[PDB]
Design an enzyme around this catalytic site. Sequence first.
Site, short mmCIF file in Angstrom:
data_model
loop_
_atom_site.label_atom_id
_atom_site.label_comp_id
_atom_site.label_asym_id
_atom_site.label_seq_id
_atom_site.Cartn_x
_atom_site.Cartn_y
_atom_site.Cartn_z
N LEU A 146 45.02 123.24 30.34
CA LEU A 146 45.84 124.43 30.12
C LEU A 146 45.15 125.43 29.18
O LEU A 146 45.28 126.64 29.35
CB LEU A 146 47.22 124.06 29.59
CG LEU A 146 48.34 125.11 29.62
CD1 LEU A 146 48.55 125.69 31.02
CD2 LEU A 146 49.64 124.50 29.10
N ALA A 147 44.40 124.91 28.21
CA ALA A 147 43.69 125.77 27.25
C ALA A 147 42.70 126.74 27.93
O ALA A 147 42.72 127.93 27.62
CB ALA A 147 43.00 124.94 26.16
N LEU A 182 42.70 134.08 9.19
CA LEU A 182 44.01 133.59 8.77
C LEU A 182 44.37 132.25 9.40
O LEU A 182 43.80 131.82 10.40
CB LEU A 182 45.09 134.65 9.07
CG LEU A 182 44.91 136.01 8.39
CD1 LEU A 182 46.02 136.95 8.79
CD2 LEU A 182 44.85 135.88 6.86
C1 LIG Z 1 36.87 139.52 25.36
C2 LIG Z 1 38.10 138.75 24.92
C3 LIG Z 1 37.84 137.24 24.93
C4 LIG Z 1 39.03 136.49 24.33
C5 LIG Z 1 38.82 134.97 24.41
C6 LIG Z 1 37.75 134.49 23.43
C7 LIG Z 1 37.58 132.96 23.47
C8 LIG Z 1 38.67 132.27 22.64
C9 LIG Z 1 38.43 130.77 22.50
C10 LIG Z 1 39.60 130.12 21.76
C11 LIG Z 1 39.44 130.20 20.24
C12 LIG Z 1 40.59 129.44 19.58
C13 LIG Z 1 40.53 129.56 18.06
C14 LIG Z 1 41.56 128.63 17.50
O1 LIG Z 1 42.75 128.94 17.58
S1 LIG Z 1 41.09 127.16 16.81
C15 LIG Z 1 42.59 126.22 16.67
C16 LIG Z 1 42.82 125.51 18.01
N1 LIG Z 1 44.10 124.80 17.98
C17 LIG Z 1 44.35 123.54 17.60
O2 LIG Z 1 43.47 122.80 17.17
C18 LIG Z 1 45.79 123.09 17.71
C19 LIG Z 1 45.98 121.62 18.13
N2 LIG Z 1 45.32 121.41 19.42
C20 LIG Z 1 45.70 121.94 20.59
O3 LIG Z 1 46.69 122.66 20.70
C21 LIG Z 1 44.87 121.60 21.81
O4 LIG Z 1 44.16 120.36 21.60
C22 LIG Z 1 43.88 122.73 22.20
C23 LIG Z 1 44.64 124.00 22.58
C24 LIG Z 1 42.90 123.03 21.07
C25 LIG Z 1 43.06 122.31 23.42
O5 LIG Z 1 43.91 121.94 24.51
P1 LIG Z 1 43.82 120.46 25.15
O6 LIG Z 1 43.41 119.51 24.05
O7 LIG Z 1 45.09 120.21 25.91
O8 LIG Z 1 42.55 120.53 26.12
P2 LIG Z 1 42.51 121.20 27.59
O9 LIG Z 1 42.27 120.10 28.59
O10 LIG Z 1 43.68 122.14 27.77
O11 LIG Z 1 41.16 122.05 27.47
C26 LIG Z 1 39.94 121.39 27.18
C27 LIG Z 1 38.90 122.46 26.91
O12 LIG Z 1 39.26 123.23 25.75
C28 LIG Z 1 38.16 123.23 24.84
N3 LIG Z 1 38.63 123.30 23.44
C29 LIG Z 1 39.15 122.32 22.69
N4 LIG Z 1 39.45 122.83 21.47
C30 LIG Z 1 39.11 124.13 21.48
C31 LIG Z 1 39.19 125.16 20.54
N5 LIG Z 1 39.68 124.92 19.30
N6 LIG Z 1 38.75 126.40 20.87
C32 LIG Z 1 38.25 126.65 22.09
N7 LIG Z 1 38.17 125.68 23.01
C33 LIG Z 1 38.60 124.43 22.73
C34 LIG Z 1 37.38 121.95 25.13
O13 LIG Z 1 36.01 122.06 24.73
C35 LIG Z 1 37.55 121.83 26.63
O14 LIG Z 1 36.61 122.66 27.29
P3 LIG Z 1 35.28 122.04 27.93
O15 LIG Z 1 34.49 121.21 26.81
O16 LIG Z 1 35.71 121.13 29.15
O17 LIG Z 1 34.38 123.29 28.40
N1 LIG Z 2 40.45 130.08 5.56
C1 LIG Z 2 40.46 128.76 5.40
C2 LIG Z 2 39.96 128.22 4.22
C3 LIG Z 2 39.95 126.85 4.01
C4 LIG Z 2 40.46 125.99 4.99
C5 LIG Z 2 40.96 126.52 6.17
C6 LIG Z 2 40.97 127.90 6.39
N2 LIG Z 2 41.49 128.36 7.61
C7 LIG Z 2 40.62 129.13 8.54
C8 LIG Z 2 41.45 130.01 9.48
N3 LIG Z 2 42.49 129.19 10.12
C9 LIG Z 2 43.48 128.82 9.09
C10 LIG Z 2 42.86 127.92 8.01
#
Ligand SMILES: CCCCCCCCCCCCCC(=O)SCCNC(=O)CCNC(=O)[C@H](O)C(C)(C)COP(=O)(O)OP(=O)(O)OC[C@H]1O[C@@H](n2cnc3c(N)ncnc32)[C@H](O)[C@@H]1OP(=O)(O)O
Ligand SMILES: Nc1ccccc1N1CCNCC1
Length: 411
Positions: free
Chosen positions: A170-171, A411
Amino acid sequence: AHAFWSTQPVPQTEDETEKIVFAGPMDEPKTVADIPEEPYPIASTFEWWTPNMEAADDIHAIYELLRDNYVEDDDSMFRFNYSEEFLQWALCPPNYIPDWHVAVRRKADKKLLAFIAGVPVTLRMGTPKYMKVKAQEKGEGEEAAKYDEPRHICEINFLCVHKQLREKRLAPILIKEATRRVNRTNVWQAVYTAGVLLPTPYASGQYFHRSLNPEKLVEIRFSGIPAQYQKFQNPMAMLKRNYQLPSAPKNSGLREMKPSDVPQVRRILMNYLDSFDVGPVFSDAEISHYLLPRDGVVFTYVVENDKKVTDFFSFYRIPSTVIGNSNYNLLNAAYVHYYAATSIPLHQLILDLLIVAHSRGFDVCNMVEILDNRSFVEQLKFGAGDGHLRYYFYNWAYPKIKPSQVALVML
Ligand SMILES: CCCCCCCCCCCCCC(=O)SCCNC(=O)CCNC(=O)[C@H](O)C(C)(C)COP(=O)(O)OP(=O)(O)OC[C@H]1O[C@@H](n2cnc3c(N)ncnc32)[C@H](O)[C@@H]1OP(=O)(O)O
Ligand SMILES: Nc1ccccc1N1CCNCC1
Protein backbone atom coordinates in the site's frame (compact mmCIF):
# COMPACT_ATOMS: atom_id res chain seq x y z
CA ALA A 1 16.39 -5.72 -4.10
CA HIS A 2 13.74 -2.98 -4.03
CA ALA A 3 10.64 -3.90 -6.06
CA PHE A 4 9.25 -0.36 -5.75
CA TRP A 5 12.32 1.87 -5.27
CA SER A 6 14.10 0.37 -8.32
CA THR A 7 11.32 1.91 -10.46
CA GLN A 8 11.80 5.43 -9.06
CA PRO A 9 14.00 8.41 -10.06
CA VAL A 10 16.44 8.05 -7.16
CA PRO A 11 20.09 6.91 -7.15
CA GLN A 12 20.05 3.12 -6.70
CA THR A 13 23.33 2.46 -4.83
CA GLU A 14 26.03 4.12 -2.71
CA ASP A 15 28.50 3.63 -5.59
CA GLU A 16 26.02 5.49 -7.77
CA THR A 17 25.74 8.42 -5.34
CA GLU A 18 29.50 8.73 -5.17
CA LYS A 19 29.64 9.32 -8.97
CA ILE A 20 27.23 12.32 -8.73
CA VAL A 21 29.07 15.61 -9.14
CA PHE A 22 26.35 18.20 -9.90
CA ALA A 23 22.88 18.93 -8.51
CA GLY A 24 20.07 18.34 -11.00
CA PRO A 25 17.01 16.23 -11.96
CA MET A 26 17.06 12.47 -12.68
CA ASP A 27 13.85 12.19 -14.74
CA GLU A 28 13.28 13.50 -18.25
CA PRO A 29 11.40 16.82 -18.44
CA LYS A 30 7.62 16.36 -18.25
CA THR A 31 4.64 18.71 -18.29
CA VAL A 32 1.52 18.75 -16.11
CA ALA A 33 -0.38 17.63 -19.25
CA ASP A 34 1.72 14.42 -19.41
CA ILE A 35 0.58 13.40 -15.92
CA PRO A 36 -2.60 11.28 -15.59
CA GLU A 37 -5.53 13.47 -14.48
CA GLU A 38 -7.25 10.62 -12.59
CA PRO A 39 -6.17 9.16 -9.24
CA TYR A 40 -4.00 6.07 -9.33
CA PRO A 41 -6.07 2.85 -9.55
CA ILE A 42 -6.85 1.36 -6.14
CA ALA A 43 -8.74 -1.77 -4.99
CA SER A 44 -12.53 -1.40 -5.33
CA THR A 45 -12.96 -1.79 -1.55
CA PHE A 46 -10.73 1.26 -0.94
CA GLU A 47 -11.02 4.94 -1.87
CA TRP A 48 -8.77 7.98 -1.98
CA TRP A 49 -9.69 10.70 0.49
CA THR A 50 -8.38 14.23 0.83
CA PRO A 51 -8.84 15.27 4.46
CA ASN A 52 -9.52 18.90 5.24
CA MET A 53 -6.66 19.43 7.61
CA GLU A 54 -8.11 22.56 8.94
CA ALA A 55 -11.40 20.75 9.93
CA ALA A 56 -11.18 19.53 13.52
CA ASP A 57 -12.84 16.19 12.79
CA ASP A 58 -10.55 15.33 9.82
CA ILE A 59 -7.47 16.34 11.84
CA HIS A 60 -8.72 14.04 14.62
CA ALA A 61 -9.05 11.07 12.22
CA ILE A 62 -5.46 11.56 11.03
CA TYR A 63 -4.39 12.02 14.67
CA GLU A 64 -5.90 8.62 15.61
CA LEU A 65 -4.26 6.80 12.71
CA LEU A 66 -0.83 8.19 13.62
CA ARG A 67 -1.33 7.70 17.38
CA ASP A 68 -1.94 3.98 16.87
CA ASN A 69 0.16 3.24 13.75
CA TYR A 70 3.01 5.75 13.26
CA VAL A 71 6.74 5.48 14.06
CA GLU A 72 7.62 3.00 16.84
CA ASP A 73 10.98 1.68 18.02
CA ASP A 74 11.79 -1.98 17.26
CA ASP A 75 11.02 -3.01 20.86
CA SER A 76 7.58 -1.36 20.81
CA MET A 77 8.43 0.79 23.81
CA PHE A 78 7.52 4.21 22.38
CA ARG A 79 5.36 5.49 19.55
CA PHE A 80 5.04 9.09 18.32
CA ASN A 81 1.85 10.80 19.52
CA TYR A 82 1.76 14.02 17.46
CA SER A 83 -1.03 16.23 18.78
CA GLU A 84 -3.96 17.52 16.72
CA GLU A 85 -2.64 21.07 17.13
CA PHE A 86 0.81 19.98 15.94
CA LEU A 87 -0.68 18.27 12.89
CA GLN A 88 -2.65 21.36 11.85
CA TRP A 89 0.54 23.44 12.25
CA ALA A 90 2.79 21.00 10.37
CA LEU A 91 0.40 20.34 7.49
CA CYS A 92 -1.01 23.82 6.82
CA PRO A 93 1.91 26.24 6.35
CA PRO A 94 1.52 29.35 4.15
CA ASN A 95 0.36 28.49 0.63
CA TYR A 96 -0.10 24.77 1.42
CA ILE A 97 -1.84 22.61 -1.21
CA PRO A 98 -4.81 20.67 0.24
CA ASP A 99 -4.54 18.05 -2.55
CA TRP A 100 -1.05 17.07 -1.32
CA HIS A 101 -2.54 15.50 1.82
CA VAL A 102 -3.41 12.00 0.64
CA ALA A 103 -5.36 9.36 2.56
CA VAL A 104 -6.80 5.92 1.88
CA ARG A 105 -10.01 4.84 3.57
CA ARG A 106 -12.07 1.66 3.49
CA LYS A 107 -15.31 2.30 1.58
CA ALA A 108 -17.55 0.10 3.76
CA ASP A 109 -16.97 1.69 7.18
CA LYS A 110 -14.89 4.74 6.15
CA LYS A 111 -12.03 3.57 8.39
CA LEU A 112 -8.81 5.47 7.67
CA LEU A 113 -6.16 2.99 6.54
CA ALA A 114 -3.24 5.09 5.31
CA PHE A 115 -1.86 8.62 4.98
CA ILE A 116 0.96 10.61 3.43
CA ALA A 117 1.45 14.38 3.53
CA GLY A 118 3.26 16.84 1.30
CA VAL A 119 3.81 20.53 2.05
CA PRO A 120 5.50 23.20 -0.07
CA VAL A 121 9.02 24.29 0.83
CA THR A 122 11.45 26.63 -0.91
CA LEU A 123 14.78 24.81 -0.69
CA ARG A 124 18.33 25.68 -1.65
CA MET A 125 19.59 22.46 -3.22
CA GLY A 126 22.28 23.51 -5.68
CA THR A 127 25.67 21.78 -5.91
CA PRO A 128 27.42 21.75 -2.47
CA LYS A 129 30.47 23.96 -1.78
CA TYR A 130 33.06 21.15 -1.79
CA MET A 131 31.80 19.94 -5.18
CA LYS A 132 31.76 23.48 -6.58
CA VAL A 133 35.46 23.66 -5.67
CA LYS A 134 36.09 20.41 -7.59
CA ALA A 135 34.07 21.85 -10.49
CA GLN A 136 36.21 25.01 -10.50
CA GLU A 137 39.37 22.87 -10.51
CA LYS A 138 38.00 21.05 -13.59
CA GLY A 139 36.63 24.10 -15.43
CA GLU A 140 33.07 22.83 -14.90
CA GLY A 141 31.60 25.78 -12.97
CA GLU A 142 28.62 26.51 -15.23
CA GLU A 143 27.20 22.98 -14.98
CA ALA A 144 27.70 23.03 -11.20
CA ALA A 145 25.85 26.34 -10.76
CA LYS A 146 22.92 25.50 -13.07
CA TYR A 147 20.46 24.75 -10.24
CA ASP A 148 21.68 27.24 -7.60
CA GLU A 149 18.38 29.14 -7.45
CA PRO A 150 16.11 28.14 -4.53
CA ARG A 151 13.48 25.67 -5.72
CA HIS A 152 9.80 25.36 -4.86
CA ILE A 153 9.48 21.68 -4.01
CA CYS A 154 7.51 19.18 -1.91
CA GLU A 155 8.44 18.07 1.60
CA ILE A 156 6.99 14.61 2.39
CA ASN A 157 6.20 13.48 5.95
CA PHE A 158 3.74 11.37 7.98
CA LEU A 159 3.73 8.32 5.69
CA CYS A 160 1.66 5.75 7.60
CA VAL A 161 -0.09 2.46 6.84
CA HIS A 162 -2.43 0.89 9.42
CA LYS A 163 -0.89 -2.11 11.22
CA GLN A 164 -3.62 -4.42 9.83
CA LEU A 165 -2.59 -3.49 6.27
CA ARG A 166 1.22 -3.77 6.57
CA GLU A 167 3.27 -5.49 3.85
CA LYS A 168 0.45 -5.39 1.28
CA ARG A 169 2.29 -2.89 -0.97
CA LEU A 170 0.00 0.00 0.00
CA ALA A 171 2.91 2.37 0.73
CA PRO A 172 4.16 2.36 -2.89
CA ILE A 173 0.60 3.18 -4.10
CA LEU A 174 0.41 6.12 -1.64
CA ILE A 175 3.78 7.35 -2.85
CA LYS A 176 2.77 7.07 -6.54
CA GLU A 177 -0.47 8.97 -5.92
CA ALA A 178 1.27 11.67 -3.88
CA THR A 179 3.84 11.98 -6.70
CA ARG A 180 1.02 12.33 -9.24
CA ARG A 181 -0.77 15.08 -7.29
CA VAL A 182 2.50 16.96 -6.75
CA ASN A 183 3.46 16.58 -10.44
CA ARG A 184 0.01 17.94 -11.45
CA THR A 185 0.97 21.08 -9.46
CA ASN A 186 4.12 21.41 -11.66
CA VAL A 187 6.46 20.32 -8.85
CA TRP A 188 9.03 17.65 -9.67
CA GLN A 189 11.30 17.26 -6.63
CA ALA A 190 10.70 16.20 -3.07
CA VAL A 191 12.71 16.08 0.14
CA TYR A 192 12.09 13.65 3.00
CA THR A 193 13.78 11.99 5.94
CA ALA A 194 13.58 8.43 7.20
CA GLY A 195 15.11 6.52 10.11
CA VAL A 196 15.57 3.57 7.76
CA LEU A 197 18.08 3.13 4.94
CA LEU A 198 16.54 3.45 1.47
CA PRO A 199 18.05 4.24 -1.94
CA THR A 200 19.85 6.60 -1.51
CA PRO A 201 20.54 9.24 1.18
CA TYR A 202 22.48 12.42 0.47
CA ALA A 203 23.15 12.85 4.20
CA SER A 204 22.93 10.81 7.39
CA GLY A 205 23.19 12.01 10.98
CA GLN A 206 23.17 10.44 14.42
CA TYR A 207 20.40 11.28 16.85
CA PHE A 208 21.29 13.00 20.14
CA HIS A 209 19.40 13.15 23.45
CA ARG A 210 19.76 15.35 26.53
CA SER A 211 18.15 13.99 29.69
CA LEU A 212 15.96 16.55 31.48
CA ASN A 213 14.04 14.18 33.80
CA PRO A 214 16.53 11.31 34.26
CA GLU A 215 14.48 9.49 36.90
CA LYS A 216 11.48 9.17 34.57
CA LEU A 217 13.68 8.22 31.58
CA VAL A 218 15.17 5.32 33.60
CA GLU A 219 11.76 4.21 34.91
CA ILE A 220 10.30 4.01 31.38
CA ARG A 221 13.51 2.39 30.06
CA PHE A 222 14.26 5.20 27.59
CA SER A 223 17.69 5.39 29.22
CA GLY A 224 19.70 3.08 31.42
CA ILE A 225 21.86 3.88 34.42
CA PRO A 226 25.43 3.71 33.02
CA ALA A 227 27.72 1.08 34.60
CA GLN A 228 30.04 3.64 36.26
CA TYR A 229 27.14 4.96 38.39
CA GLN A 230 27.15 1.66 40.31
CA LYS A 231 30.34 2.87 42.02
CA PHE A 232 28.15 5.42 43.85
CA GLN A 233 26.19 4.76 47.06
CA ASN A 234 23.16 6.37 45.40
CA PRO A 235 23.30 5.97 41.59
CA MET A 236 19.96 7.72 40.96
CA ALA A 237 20.83 10.72 43.16
CA MET A 238 24.09 11.12 41.22
CA LEU A 239 22.29 10.77 37.87
CA LYS A 240 19.84 13.50 38.92
CA ARG A 241 22.70 15.74 40.07
CA ASN A 242 24.70 15.27 36.86
CA TYR A 243 21.77 16.39 34.66
CA GLN A 244 20.44 19.16 36.92
CA LEU A 245 19.68 22.49 35.26
CA PRO A 246 19.13 26.07 36.41
CA SER A 247 15.53 26.91 37.34
CA ALA A 248 15.52 30.06 35.20
CA PRO A 249 17.26 31.22 31.96
CA LYS A 250 20.79 32.64 32.21
CA ASN A 251 20.67 35.12 29.33
CA SER A 252 19.29 38.50 30.37
CA GLY A 253 16.79 39.76 27.81
CA LEU A 254 15.57 36.30 26.85
CA ARG A 255 11.84 36.48 26.10
CA GLU A 256 9.24 34.76 23.93
CA MET A 257 9.21 35.75 20.27
CA LYS A 258 6.48 38.22 19.19
CA PRO A 259 5.04 39.08 15.73
CA SER A 260 7.13 42.29 15.68
CA ASP A 261 10.26 40.07 15.85
CA VAL A 262 9.50 38.31 12.52
CA PRO A 263 11.64 40.54 10.24
CA GLN A 264 14.74 40.45 12.51
CA VAL A 265 14.41 36.71 13.16
CA ARG A 266 14.03 36.14 9.39
CA ARG A 267 17.19 38.19 8.76
CA ILE A 268 19.45 36.46 11.30
CA LEU A 269 18.09 32.98 10.51
CA MET A 270 18.47 33.40 6.73
CA ASN A 271 21.97 34.88 7.11
CA TYR A 272 22.90 31.79 9.13
CA LEU A 273 21.18 29.12 7.01
CA ASP A 274 22.58 30.48 3.73
CA SER A 275 25.99 29.14 4.90
CA PHE A 276 24.81 25.50 4.60
CA ASP A 277 24.68 23.48 1.34
CA VAL A 278 21.03 22.42 1.77
CA GLY A 279 18.62 24.74 3.56
CA PRO A 280 15.16 26.29 3.41
CA VAL A 281 14.33 29.83 2.36
CA PHE A 282 11.59 31.37 4.50
CA SER A 283 9.32 34.34 3.81
CA ASP A 284 7.97 36.59 6.60
CA ALA A 285 4.76 34.51 6.49
CA GLU A 286 6.74 31.27 6.87
CA ILE A 287 8.88 32.65 9.73
CA SER A 288 5.61 33.69 11.46
CA HIS A 289 4.07 30.27 10.87
CA TYR A 290 6.98 28.04 11.80
CA LEU A 291 8.42 30.11 14.66
CA LEU A 292 5.77 32.16 16.50
CA PRO A 293 4.95 30.36 19.78
CA ARG A 294 2.01 27.96 19.68
CA ASP A 295 0.76 26.42 22.91
CA GLY A 296 1.93 22.81 23.24
CA VAL A 297 3.47 22.82 19.75
CA VAL A 298 6.34 25.27 19.16
CA PHE A 299 8.30 27.35 21.66
CA THR A 300 10.51 30.21 20.48
CA TYR A 301 12.60 32.68 22.42
CA VAL A 302 14.66 35.67 21.37
CA VAL A 303 17.61 37.33 23.09
CA GLU A 304 16.88 41.04 23.19
CA ASN A 305 19.47 43.34 24.72
CA ASP A 306 19.84 47.06 23.97
CA LYS A 307 16.36 46.77 22.35
CA LYS A 308 17.61 44.56 19.48
CA VAL A 309 17.11 40.85 18.76
CA THR A 310 20.56 39.32 18.36
CA ASP A 311 19.89 35.60 18.97
CA PHE A 312 16.96 33.18 19.03
CA PHE A 313 16.14 29.53 19.55
CA SER A 314 13.09 27.38 18.91
CA PHE A 315 11.98 23.90 19.92
CA TYR A 316 8.91 21.82 19.11
CA ARG A 317 7.03 19.21 21.13
CA ILE A 318 6.29 15.63 20.13
CA PRO A 319 5.14 13.40 22.95
CA SER A 320 5.50 9.65 22.56
CA THR A 321 3.14 7.05 23.94
CA VAL A 322 4.85 4.94 26.59
CA ILE A 323 3.49 1.64 25.34
CA GLY A 324 4.41 -0.92 28.02
CA ASN A 325 4.72 1.01 31.28
CA SER A 326 1.33 1.50 33.00
CA ASN A 327 2.61 4.28 35.32
CA TYR A 328 3.23 6.85 32.55
CA ASN A 329 1.10 7.78 29.56
CA LEU A 330 3.60 9.95 27.69
CA LEU A 331 7.25 10.74 27.13
CA ASN A 332 7.32 14.51 26.66
CA ALA A 333 10.09 15.33 24.19
CA ALA A 334 11.41 18.72 23.07
CA TYR A 335 13.09 18.84 19.65
CA VAL A 336 15.73 21.45 18.76
CA HIS A 337 14.24 23.48 15.89
CA TYR A 338 15.83 26.53 14.18
CA TYR A 339 18.18 28.93 15.96
CA ALA A 340 20.76 31.65 15.30
CA ALA A 341 23.40 33.16 17.55
CA THR A 342 25.21 36.43 16.83
CA SER A 343 25.98 37.82 20.31
CA ILE A 344 26.65 34.73 22.45
CA PRO A 345 28.27 31.30 21.97
CA LEU A 346 25.87 28.65 20.72
CA HIS A 347 26.27 26.49 23.87
CA GLN A 348 25.20 29.51 25.95
CA LEU A 349 22.08 30.01 23.81
CA ILE A 350 21.10 26.33 23.79
CA LEU A 351 21.66 26.01 27.56
CA ASP A 352 18.68 28.35 27.88
CA LEU A 353 16.70 26.06 25.54
CA LEU A 354 17.34 23.13 27.92
CA ILE A 355 16.44 25.31 30.93
CA VAL A 356 13.12 26.42 29.39
CA ALA A 357 12.26 22.90 28.22
CA HIS A 358 13.01 21.47 31.67
CA SER A 359 10.98 24.14 33.47
CA ARG A 360 8.02 23.48 31.14
CA GLY A 361 8.01 19.78 32.11
CA PHE A 362 9.82 18.18 29.16
CA ASP A 363 11.64 14.90 29.90
CA VAL A 364 14.25 14.89 27.15
CA CYS A 365 15.60 17.17 24.44
CA ASN A 366 16.23 15.56 21.05
CA MET A 367 18.11 16.60 17.92
CA VAL A 368 20.03 15.31 14.90
CA GLU A 369 23.65 16.37 14.17
CA ILE A 370 22.59 18.89 11.49
CA LEU A 371 23.22 22.67 11.57
CA ASP A 372 25.89 23.42 14.23
CA ASN A 373 24.37 20.96 16.71
CA ARG A 374 27.72 19.15 17.16
CA SER A 375 29.24 22.31 18.63
CA PHE A 376 27.33 21.96 21.93
CA VAL A 377 26.92 18.16 22.27
CA GLU A 378 29.68 17.67 24.83
CA GLN A 379 29.24 20.79 26.99
CA LEU A 380 25.46 20.45 27.26
CA LYS A 381 25.70 16.71 28.01
CA PHE A 382 23.89 15.35 24.95
CA GLY A 383 24.51 11.68 24.21
CA ALA A 384 24.31 9.89 20.88
CA GLY A 385 21.19 7.76 20.38
CA ASP A 386 20.34 4.64 18.37
CA GLY A 387 20.55 4.62 14.56
CA HIS A 388 20.50 7.59 12.16
CA LEU A 389 18.21 10.07 10.47
CA ARG A 390 18.76 9.96 6.71
CA TYR A 391 17.93 12.78 4.29
CA TYR A 392 16.67 12.01 0.78
CA PHE A 393 15.66 13.71 -2.44
CA TYR A 394 13.12 12.45 -4.96
CA ASN A 395 14.20 13.15 -8.56
CA TRP A 396 17.34 15.08 -7.61
CA ALA A 397 20.89 13.91 -8.16
CA TYR A 398 23.01 15.15 -5.27
CA PRO A 399 26.53 14.40 -3.99
CA LYS A 400 26.93 13.01 -0.46
CA ILE A 401 27.28 15.77 2.12
CA LYS A 402 28.08 15.84 5.84
CA PRO A 403 25.04 16.32 8.12
CA SER A 404 26.70 19.53 9.33
CA GLN A 405 25.97 20.93 5.85
CA VAL A 406 22.22 20.35 6.22
CA ALA A 407 20.04 23.17 7.55
CA LEU A 408 16.59 21.64 7.01
CA VAL A 409 14.88 20.64 10.27
CA MET A 410 12.16 18.10 9.70
CA LEU A 411 9.07 17.86 11.91
C1 LIG B 1 7.75 14.96 -6.83
C2 LIG B 1 6.95 14.56 -5.61
C3 LIG B 1 7.40 13.21 -5.06
C4 LIG B 1 6.70 12.89 -3.74
C5 LIG B 1 7.08 11.50 -3.23
C6 LIG B 1 8.52 11.46 -2.70
C7 LIG B 1 8.88 10.08 -2.13
C8 LIG B 1 8.35 9.93 -0.71
C9 LIG B 1 8.85 8.65 -0.04
C10 LIG B 1 8.20 8.49 1.34
C11 LIG B 1 8.96 9.25 2.43
C12 LIG B 1 8.31 8.97 3.78
C13 LIG B 1 8.97 9.77 4.89
C14 LIG B 1 8.42 9.27 6.20
O1 LIG B 1 7.27 9.59 6.51
S1 LIG B 1 9.34 8.26 7.18
C15 LIG B 1 8.20 7.59 8.36
C16 LIG B 1 7.54 6.36 7.72
N1 LIG B 1 6.51 5.83 8.61
C17 LIG B 1 6.64 4.91 9.58
O2 LIG B 1 7.72 4.39 9.86
C18 LIG B 1 5.37 4.55 10.32
C19 LIG B 1 5.24 3.07 10.72
N2 LIG B 1 5.33 2.25 9.52
C20 LIG B 1 4.43 2.19 8.52
O3 LIG B 1 3.39 2.85 8.55
C21 LIG B 1 4.73 1.28 7.36
O4 LIG B 1 5.63 0.23 7.76
C22 LIG B 1 5.28 2.03 6.13
C23 LIG B 1 4.25 3.02 5.59
C24 LIG B 1 6.58 2.76 6.45
C25 LIG B 1 5.58 1.04 5.00
O5 LIG B 1 4.42 0.26 4.68
P1 LIG B 1 4.46 -1.34 4.79
O6 LIG B 1 5.42 -1.70 5.89
O7 LIG B 1 3.04 -1.83 4.85
O8 LIG B 1 5.19 -1.82 3.44
P2 LIG B 1 4.52 -1.91 1.98
O9 LIG B 1 4.49 -3.36 1.57
O10 LIG B 1 3.25 -1.08 1.92
O11 LIG B 1 5.65 -1.19 1.11
C26 LIG B 1 6.97 -1.71 1.09
C27 LIG B 1 7.85 -0.71 0.38
O12 LIG B 1 7.89 0.53 1.11
C28 LIG B 1 9.26 0.88 1.34
N3 LIG B 1 9.40 1.62 2.61
C29 LIG B 1 9.39 1.14 3.86
N4 LIG B 1 9.55 2.17 4.72
C30 LIG B 1 9.65 3.30 4.00
C31 LIG B 1 9.82 4.64 4.31
N5 LIG B 1 9.92 5.04 5.60
N6 LIG B 1 9.89 5.56 3.32
C32 LIG B 1 9.79 5.19 2.03
N7 LIG B 1 9.63 3.90 1.70
C33 LIG B 1 9.55 2.94 2.67
C34 LIG B 1 10.03 -0.43 1.35
O13 LIG B 1 11.41 -0.24 1.01
C35 LIG B 1 9.27 -1.22 0.30
O14 LIG B 1 9.72 -0.86 -0.99
P3 LIG B 1 10.74 -1.78 -1.80
O15 LIG B 1 12.04 -2.06 -0.89
O16 LIG B 1 10.00 -3.13 -2.17
O17 LIG B 1 11.18 -0.96 -3.11
N1 LIG C 1 14.13 16.00 14.43
C1 LIG C 1 14.38 14.91 15.15
C2 LIG C 1 15.40 14.95 16.10
C3 LIG C 1 15.70 13.83 16.87
C4 LIG C 1 14.97 12.65 16.70
C5 LIG C 1 13.95 12.60 15.75
C6 LIG C 1 13.64 13.73 14.98
N2 LIG C 1 12.60 13.61 14.04
C7 LIG C 1 12.89 13.79 12.59
C8 LIG C 1 11.63 14.20 11.83
N3 LIG C 1 10.55 13.24 12.14
C9 LIG C 1 10.13 13.46 13.54
C10 LIG C 1 11.27 13.12 14.51
